[PDB]
Amino acid sequence: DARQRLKEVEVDDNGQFMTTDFGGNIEEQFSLKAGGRGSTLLEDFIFRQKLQHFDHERIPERVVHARGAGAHGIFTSYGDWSNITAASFLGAKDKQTPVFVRFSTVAGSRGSADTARDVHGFATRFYTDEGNFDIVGNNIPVFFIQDAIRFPDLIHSVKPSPDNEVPQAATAHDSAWDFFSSQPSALHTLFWAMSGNGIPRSYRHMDGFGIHTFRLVTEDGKSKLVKWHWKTKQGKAALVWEEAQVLAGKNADFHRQDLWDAIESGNAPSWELAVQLIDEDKAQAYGFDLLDPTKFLPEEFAPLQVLGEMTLNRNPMNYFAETEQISFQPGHIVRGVDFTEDPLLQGRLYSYLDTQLNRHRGPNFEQLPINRPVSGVHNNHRDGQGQAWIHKNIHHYSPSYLNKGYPAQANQTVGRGFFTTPGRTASGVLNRELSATFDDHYTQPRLFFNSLTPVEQQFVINAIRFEASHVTNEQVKKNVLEQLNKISNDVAKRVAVALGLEAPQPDPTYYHNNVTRGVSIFNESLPTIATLRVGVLSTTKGGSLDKAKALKEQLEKDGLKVTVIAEYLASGVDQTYSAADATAFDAVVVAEGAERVFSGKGAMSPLFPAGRPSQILTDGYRWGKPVAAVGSAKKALQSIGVEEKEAGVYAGAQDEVIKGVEEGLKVFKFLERFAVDGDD
Amino acid sequence: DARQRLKEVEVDDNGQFMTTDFGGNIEEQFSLKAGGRGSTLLEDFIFRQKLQHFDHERIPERVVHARGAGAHGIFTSYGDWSNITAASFLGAKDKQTPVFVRFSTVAGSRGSADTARDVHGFATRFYTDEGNFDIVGNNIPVFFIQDAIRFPDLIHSVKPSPDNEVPQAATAHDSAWDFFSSQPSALHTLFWAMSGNGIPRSYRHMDGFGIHTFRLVTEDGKSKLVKWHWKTKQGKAALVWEEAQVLAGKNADFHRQDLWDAIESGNAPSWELAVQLIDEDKAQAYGFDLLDPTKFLPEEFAPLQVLGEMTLNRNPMNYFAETEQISFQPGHIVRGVDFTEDPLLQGRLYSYLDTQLNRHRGPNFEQLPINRPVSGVHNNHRDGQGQAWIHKNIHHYSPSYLNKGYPAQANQTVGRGFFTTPGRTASGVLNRELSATFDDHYTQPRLFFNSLTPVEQQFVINAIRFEASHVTNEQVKKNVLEQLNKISNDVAKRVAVALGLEAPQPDPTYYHNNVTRGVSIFNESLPTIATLRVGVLSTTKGGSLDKAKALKEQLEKDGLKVTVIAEYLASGVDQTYSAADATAFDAVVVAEGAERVFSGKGAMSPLFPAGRPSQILTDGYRWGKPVAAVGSAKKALQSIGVEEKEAGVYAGAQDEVIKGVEEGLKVFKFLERFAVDG
Amino acid sequence: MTLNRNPMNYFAETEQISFQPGHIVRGVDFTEDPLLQGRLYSYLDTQLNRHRGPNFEQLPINRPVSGVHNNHRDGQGQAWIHKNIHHYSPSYLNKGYPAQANQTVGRGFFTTPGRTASGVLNRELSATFDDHYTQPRLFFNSLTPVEQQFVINAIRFEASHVTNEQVKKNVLEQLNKISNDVAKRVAVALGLEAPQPDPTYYHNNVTRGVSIFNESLPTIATLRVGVLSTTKGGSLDKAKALKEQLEKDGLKVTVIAEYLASGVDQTYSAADATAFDAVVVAEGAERVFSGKGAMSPLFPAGRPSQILTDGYRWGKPVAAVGSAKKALQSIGVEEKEAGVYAGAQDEVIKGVEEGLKVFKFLERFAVDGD
Numbered sequence A: 001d002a003r004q005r006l007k008e009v010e011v012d013d014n015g016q017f018m019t020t021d022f023g024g025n026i027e028e029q030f031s032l033k034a035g036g037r038g039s040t041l042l043e044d045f046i047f048r049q050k051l052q053h054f055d056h057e058r059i060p061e062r063v064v065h066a067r068g069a070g071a072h073g074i075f076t077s078y079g080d081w082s083n084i085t086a087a088s089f090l091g092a093k094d095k096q097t098p099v100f101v102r103f104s105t106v107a108g109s110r111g112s113a114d115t116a117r118d119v120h121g122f123a124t125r126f127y128t129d130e131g132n133f134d135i136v137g138n139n140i141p142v143f144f145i146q147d148a149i150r151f152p153d154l155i156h157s158v159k160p161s162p163d164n165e166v167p168q169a170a171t172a173h174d175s176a177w178d179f180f181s182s183q184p185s186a187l188h189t190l191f192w193a194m195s196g197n198g199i200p201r202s203y204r205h206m207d208g209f210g211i212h213t214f215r216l217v218t219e220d221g222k223s224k225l226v227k228w229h230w231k232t233k234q235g236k237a238a239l240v241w242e243e244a245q246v247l248a249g250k251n252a253d254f255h256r257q258d259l260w261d262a263i264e265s266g267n268a269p270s271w272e273l274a275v276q277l278i279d280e281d282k283a284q285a286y287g288f289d290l291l292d293p294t295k296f297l298p299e300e301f302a303p304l305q306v307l308g309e310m311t312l313n314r315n316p317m318n319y320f321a322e323t324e325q326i327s328f329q330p331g332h333i334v335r336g337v338d339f340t341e342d343p344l345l346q347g348r349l350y351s352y353l354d355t356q357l358n359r360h361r362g363p364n365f366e367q368l369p370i371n372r373p374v375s376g377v378h379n380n381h382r383d384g385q386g387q388a389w390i391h392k393n394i395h396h397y398s399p400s401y402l403n404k405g406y407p408a409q410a411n412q413t414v415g416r417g418f419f420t421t422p423g424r425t426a427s428g429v430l431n432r433e434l435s436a437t438f439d440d441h442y443t444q445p446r447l448f449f450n451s452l453t454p455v456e457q458q459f460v461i462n463a464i465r466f467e468a469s470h471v472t473n474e475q476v477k478k479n480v481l482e483q484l485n486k487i488s489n490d491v492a493k494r495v496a497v498a499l500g501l502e503a504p505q506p507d508p509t510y511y512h513n514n515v516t517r518g519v520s521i522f523n524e525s526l527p528t529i530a531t532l533r534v535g536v537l538s539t540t541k542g543g544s545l546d547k548a549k550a551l552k553e554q555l556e557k558d559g560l561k562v563t564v565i566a567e568y569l570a571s572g573v574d575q576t577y578s579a580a581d582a583t584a585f586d587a588v589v590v591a592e593g594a595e596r597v598f599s600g601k602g603a604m605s606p607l608f609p610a611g612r613p614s615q616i617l618t619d620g621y622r623w624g625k626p627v628a629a630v631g632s633a634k635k636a637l638q639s640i641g642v643e644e645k646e647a648g649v650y651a652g653a654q655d656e657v658i659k660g661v662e663e664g665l666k667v668f669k670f671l672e673r674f675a676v677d678g679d680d
Numbered sequence B: 001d002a003r004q005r006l007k008e009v010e011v012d013d014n015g016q017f018m019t020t021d022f023g024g025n026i027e028e029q030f031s032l033k034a035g036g037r038g039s040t041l042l043e044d045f046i047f048r049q050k051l052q053h054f055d056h057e058r059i060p061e062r063v064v065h066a067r068g069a070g071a072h073g074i075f076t077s078y079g080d081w082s083n084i085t086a087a088s089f090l091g092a093k094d095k096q097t098p099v100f101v102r103f104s105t106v107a108g109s110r111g112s113a114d115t116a117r118d119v120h121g122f123a124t125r126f127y128t129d130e131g132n133f134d135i136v137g138n139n140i141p142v143f144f145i146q147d148a149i150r151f152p153d154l155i156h157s158v159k160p161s162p163d164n165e166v167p168q169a170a171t172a173h174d175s176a177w178d179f180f181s182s183q184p185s186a187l188h189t190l191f192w193a194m195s196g197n198g199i200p201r202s203y204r205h206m207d208g209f210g211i212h213t214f215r216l217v218t219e220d221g222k223s224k225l226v227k228w229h230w231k232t233k234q235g236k237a238a239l240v241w242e243e244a245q246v247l248a249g250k251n252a253d254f255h256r257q258d259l260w261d262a263i264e265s266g267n268a269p270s271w272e273l274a275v276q277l278i279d280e281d282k283a284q285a286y287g288f289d290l291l292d293p294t295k296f297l298p299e300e301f302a303p304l305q306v307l308g309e310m311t312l313n314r315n316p317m318n319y320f321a322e323t324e325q326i327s328f329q330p331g332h333i334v335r336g337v338d339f340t341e342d343p344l345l346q347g348r349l350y351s352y353l354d355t356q357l358n359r360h361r362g363p364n365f366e367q368l369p370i371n372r373p374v375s376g377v378h379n380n381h382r383d384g385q386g387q388a389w390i391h392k393n394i395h396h397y398s399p400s401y402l403n404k405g406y407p408a409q410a411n412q413t414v415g416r417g418f419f420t421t422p423g424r425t426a427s428g429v430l431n432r433e434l435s436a437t438f439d440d441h442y443t444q445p446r447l448f449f450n451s452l453t454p455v456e457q458q459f460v461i462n463a464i465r466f467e468a469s470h471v472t473n474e475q476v477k478k479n480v481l482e483q484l485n486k487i488s489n490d491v492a493k494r495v496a497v498a499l500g501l502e503a504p505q506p507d508p509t510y511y512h513n514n515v516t517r518g519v520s521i522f523n524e525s526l527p528t529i530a531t532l533r534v535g536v537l538s539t540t541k542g543g544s545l546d547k548a549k550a551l552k553e554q555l556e557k558d559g560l561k562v563t564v565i566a567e568y569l570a571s572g573v574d575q576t577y578s579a580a581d582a583t584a585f586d587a588v589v590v591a592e593g594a595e596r597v598f599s600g601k602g603a604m605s606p607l608f609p610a611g612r613p614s615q616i617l618t619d620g621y622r623w624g625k626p627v628a629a630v631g632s633a634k635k636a637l638q639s640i641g642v643e644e645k646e647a648g649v650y651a652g653a654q655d656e657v658i659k660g661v662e663e664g665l666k667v668f669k670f671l672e673r674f675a676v677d678g
Numbered sequence C: 001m002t003l004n005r006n007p008m009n010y011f012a013e014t015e016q017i018s019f020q021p022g023h024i025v026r027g028v029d030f031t032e033d034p035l036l037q038g039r040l041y042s043y044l045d046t047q048l049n050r051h052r053g054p055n056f057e058q059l060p061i062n063r064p065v066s067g068v069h070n071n072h073r074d075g076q077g078q079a080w081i082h083k084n085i086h087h088y089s090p091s092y093l094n095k096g097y098p099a100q101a102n103q104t105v106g107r108g109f110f111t112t113p114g115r116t117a118s119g120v121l122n123r124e125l126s127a128t129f130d131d132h133y134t135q136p137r138l139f140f141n142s143l144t145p146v147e148q149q150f151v152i153n154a155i156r157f158e159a160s161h162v163t164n165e166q167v168k169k170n171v172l173e174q175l176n177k178i179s180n181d182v183a184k185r186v187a188v189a190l191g192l193e194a195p196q197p198d199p200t201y202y203h204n205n206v207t208r209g210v211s212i213f214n215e216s217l218p219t220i221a222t223l224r225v226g227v228l229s230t231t232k233g234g235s236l237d238k239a240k241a242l243k244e245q246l247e248k249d250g251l252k253v254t255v256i257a258e259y260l261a262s263g264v265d266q267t268y269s270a271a272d273a274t275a276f277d278a279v280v281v282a283e284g285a286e287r288v289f290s291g292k293g294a295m296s297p298l299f300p301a302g303r304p305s306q307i308l309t310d311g312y313r314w315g316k317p318v319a320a321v322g323s324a325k326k327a328l329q330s331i332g333v334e335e336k337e338a339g340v341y342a343g344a345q346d347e348v349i350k351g352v353e354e355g356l357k358v359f360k361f362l363e364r365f366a367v368d369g370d
């Protein structure tokens, strides 16, 4: 059990009498009053201790990445990697290390929707036996900006307008696009956010990236540059925008529920941890500067090398104590790893330590059960709000004769202490500048765009068209086109159409035709369909339900999560039509006989909103899902104008349909259902 | 200007150089580094002071009502009400008092959707010349529970499950319905939240209530029991659930944007302050106890008496400093008003003062500009985190020879001091009980349900059906049905259908057929259609767009907010089909010629999702909106199987369409489009 | 109650502990004491400031040993992980746990059943509270004469710091309501007129148990004794034997000399009479009370004499062994006085230990009108 160390602070209230927080059994359902219909007494200590705790329940949300969810798991090393790093957790084959991972969006506050369009966080803690090591990453490999000092500008610009706090969890407003166009380094991440990476299917279907180049360091102090990669074993998958929007309303908790359910059902997600490794002397050898976080390193120059695998298999017991309270830091480093002079990474080291003081209102947040290392803390730190320990050493200072030198200094040769990479040097003038090597903001967005499928390219363009059409300032929209046009003239043209602005002239300085692998989502079939959801549309009239039941049992044997939907919760029914929506499912199947609710008296029930069964099948089809109808239910497909042999449409007997749907699920989204510029 | 007093704290940065927080001009776009590609230096004081401020921007959200928005305005008394209260803001005809109001949901965290189904907050501050007086109310006249000590129980149960923090801003889960059925007092508020009150059209289309019985007290110390009401001058309006859900995703900010826009467009919303006034001897006279906050007093026993009018006419300049930081308290009371022994209200007095300590991290939150009274603060309080004043009186205690008795004691007779109603007495044993007069949890929910239109009743039934079907535990569902059955056997039966269960046999103990006025939403037409939104579906091809401009110009001259929609932002187009959704509008009109986007090639642009124009018209129709098509655009109505002859459906020329749409907007929702059981 | 363990970390234990009068258990209840009533609110509330959060009862020093089971969750610094996901009551889903306790089940707390409220809601105090003078007089009546003089001299000292003349007059007017004699005696120091008696509250009643100086100590265990010695001659060997005997008798002894020679616990420079309950000069150490020995760069001028002087003037047992009597003579202190002891080591030890029980010798303090 990854949560094993947390067991000692777990509190079971079953079979117990109610108490105050200072002990003593009580009742707490009535206020103490002065007479029968009397005023409440101040001496009601029970009322006040209960309400005080309630009144003070909330802590500040995270300043960014406020919306998220997490789970515990185990990381397993595939080998002894002491040849490239002294890091203990990678020091042997099959070595296991507990982890906790929190996934998130970026902009929205605590209660905003999981399926907002946004960059997503992917933060991992390794509780190693040489300290906590955090890889605080995202599902996109490049960041908007090049210097940490600009983070409040970025964040202010994408978060709600400060006059009315509108809009929630969205970059679709003036200030965000004023920023993206005024600070062109942002264009690369913006393109990734406008792609499927901005609206993934689940946390489990995301890759993860450390983004920054870090350093791996060996015992003898030799270093290599490194990019961290998390490669999802469930495969990458994304929604379409018009679907994500409905889903934001129908189930704001779509992603946190997906993760929870996968883990509860014994389908723990896994990712492989992989690295790109680069010689120190090649930091500027690949067409950009590896200290620049707005660029990624094409796998064709440096392939991924797999170090191990992480599996998330335990949900938290209390979301607040565990998920909400956990405090990640890139400053959480261990011997064997070092920083680089990435000016974005540099400032992060300051900010995440500092922000905990606000979020936890004190300096002792590392003493919280979810933050505690498993390797033990020995130092001369004392006092601090909420100090949870009692220190025995009264000589809390170094150096000292009285404490015999304990606790003792550890370094490269003694005590396996941390050490900064021995070869690192500083050269030149103290400066408030950025290297001119950081200056190309267009080549990689163009590279990224070239590397997507034609329909994926269209999704990016349509995302931009949708977003920029919300910008009220005409000049900002012009500034946006001008920047887009430096990346690609065709992209600018296609976006300009939506905005009713003139197709601008080519600005070819940065244009190129290069491609790189592995940045696309939709052109690779999923390697597994386990956990994927099938909504089975049935009816309580006739024999449809019994057929629905058999269909479900078969699909379940194949690892799918099936929801049988009907007018009311009859035996075998998982969900009513009133409660149902296509957004909940990866495939939609009409069970035989259920064609009766797509037309006629059966479609006219007080039990669900008018048109609901048809809308479900329609949404499913239009959003590119595998859709199907068993036997006579093919009538339902006709009723919404869908033809039986379209791509990703299956009509026939149960066996056929099952086969077809499972095939369709691997493709996941059928892209031929989406118009591409130049079809009309 | 209601915000006038805030002007001295406004900071204008136009035409200025960037500075640190301690002054000194700076640049702050580059970290200071050791060498061209070097590490950032600790001595970069500029980086640290900027990022520290950013790192610390967030404060805890409200423990309840976290999601909300507000505005400034003016309350005007219609009279000298000294014959019923000593309260200064009510002491003269035409007397004006600045206000700030915040509207909210209850359960959702800060970025949750406006159109979640929930009770709504309606909190009003009067910055009177005798202190801040807050009426911290809801858009529903009764509350779930009868003793404040149960508040954490109610709120824990409705908010997300504590293991996974699901579901956001919804009562549609096991724990909530477990509590509602385990604590039957909750049933009355539940029925209201399951009606249109749970999914209102806007903050501007809500009534408000203080819920509790309070006391109005005259200078001589005589008291009357009082209920506070806010009556909207815009009329009440509500959405339908299937619409509210989509709107939650299409625009989480629907209500805050609605309020903001109405104020900027010069359409400041108004409410009348009205009271029910009854003698102390009526406390238990009307079949329930007026100290019981789970009951309301039917207007048939005590009519509304209008005291004045509040108009919200200024938006904030900074949402955080004003809306987020404002700290309401029912304990903010003034001379002329007093509490009652309502056990719910009693505990609130403690909770709102205490909780500010968490939210504002200190004791001086009343010094914040949005919280400061206009009337002067003079006492011996000193120090505390963030102390913003410098006190001149060094003899900070009373009594005292050395300060010559200042600041001085004020009471009923000197200095217009606050005073507790002189006749209030306590009698009997100290007890941890509630009166048996509180015991009937079923008669008034039945009264409420009886007083709705048949389709409104169906909406309540269908909300319960939707919600209760999310409950995984079978026994909890059975518990819910048993409790509903005590209110109405018919309700229980109709809900039980969705759940696939048998309702218990009728239990006539609390059944009755009585009705009461003013609790329905859909039964009365709106008094104005100003600000209501019309989505006009057009197209960039041919002559549609020019005709849409003409339609828009006419509609706007009659007070409407019109959005011209087309495939791309052509001249005269307000929004693209890609960006459009029916949830944003109160009426949908197809401009002549736009029928080309409902079928054929016009419907298949890569500029918008497949079927989008048809979906907007379809949603608009099924959600009960006025829908219409000018001229040949009737083909669009035909394409979705909607007939010209239907109520709330309009075709023909621009003149017939405009007149029909405007009349339909008064009806607001066409309830004949919704099926009723049987 | 016996206190037998010091804390290991002062901050974590002593600084962090949070007392409340609202920390009450079954079998105790409050009364309508208006001072007590408000404290209940204040001590809970103030912890929010001092500890910056609602979870201070979770701090090790604040935790009860008896188990905490309720539906409270979250809050700053939440140190536990709650298993029960149905964190509300009443509830079907949690099976009724944690369960209500009361007078009849689960040994719950209960308010005294017979307590009643009766009358009008008021912002008043009962007229039964109005006599502010009788008990102060009772208290003053029940102290020894010198003990009474200490009270008067404390008031004389303090009120003489008051700059405002009317405040000083107001004080005398209040003192005079308790005792005309007390008012007159205080008035002397303030240079104000002895006011006219107001007999309304005067009385001669006494009560037992409020005096400190009227009773000898039950034990002299732990009481410190500072032994003034010197590194010259045989004084230190004698100081050592004196120390060994006194510590056998349970006292804590500090041998003091010019420097930290073998046997010396403290130097004269570091020493002061305030540290000790008795002061005895070791034989031979009279050499540091005058002449060459009294004049050393190792300690401030007059230090050994000042220690003996302070010791005597502050009413402590003081003594000198043998020739050290000269030290007593050098400060005008005579062997015949109470709490002054001279002679052989045996006589001095017995005397000092008997004197430590009296603790303060009040003959050395002048009383008004003596």
Ligand code: HEM
Pocket (backbone or CB within 6 Å): A061, A062, A063, A064, A065, A068, A102, A103, A104, A120, A121, A122, A123, A136, A137, A138, A143, A147, A148, A149, A151, A210, A211, A212, A293, A326, A327, A328, A344, A345, A347, A348, A351, A352, A355, A356, A359, B051, B055
């Ligand atoms: C490569 C660039 C970045 C990545 C991959 C990244 C990723 C993340 C992630 C995943 C989280 C959420 C951790 C969680 O789940 O609790 C987070 C939070 C945060 N980030 Fe970053 N971020 C980046 C840039 C920055 C920069 C430049 C700054 C400021 C210098 C910054 C400041 C913060 C702060 C203050 C938090 C809140 C931490 C807390 O409250 O515990 N981030 N970031």
Ligand code: HEM
Pocket (backbone or CB within 6 Å): A051, A055, B061, B062, B063, B064, B065, B068, B102, B103, B104, B120, B121, B122, B123, B136, B137, B138, B143, B147, B148, B149, B151, B210, B211, B212, B293, B326, B327, B328, B344, B345, B347, B348, B351, B352, B355, B356, B359
């Ligand atoms: C008739 C019953 C109630 C009504 C009408 C009501 C209404 C409201 C409203 C409108 C707000 C939001 C104020 C704002 O916009 O900032 C609020 C917040 C709050 N309520 Fe109540 N509520 C009721 C019951 C209770 C009870 C019984 C308690 C506790 C005993 C309570 C404790 C709180 C707290 C602690 C807040 C947050 C205040 C802040 O952070 O500034 N409420 N309530």
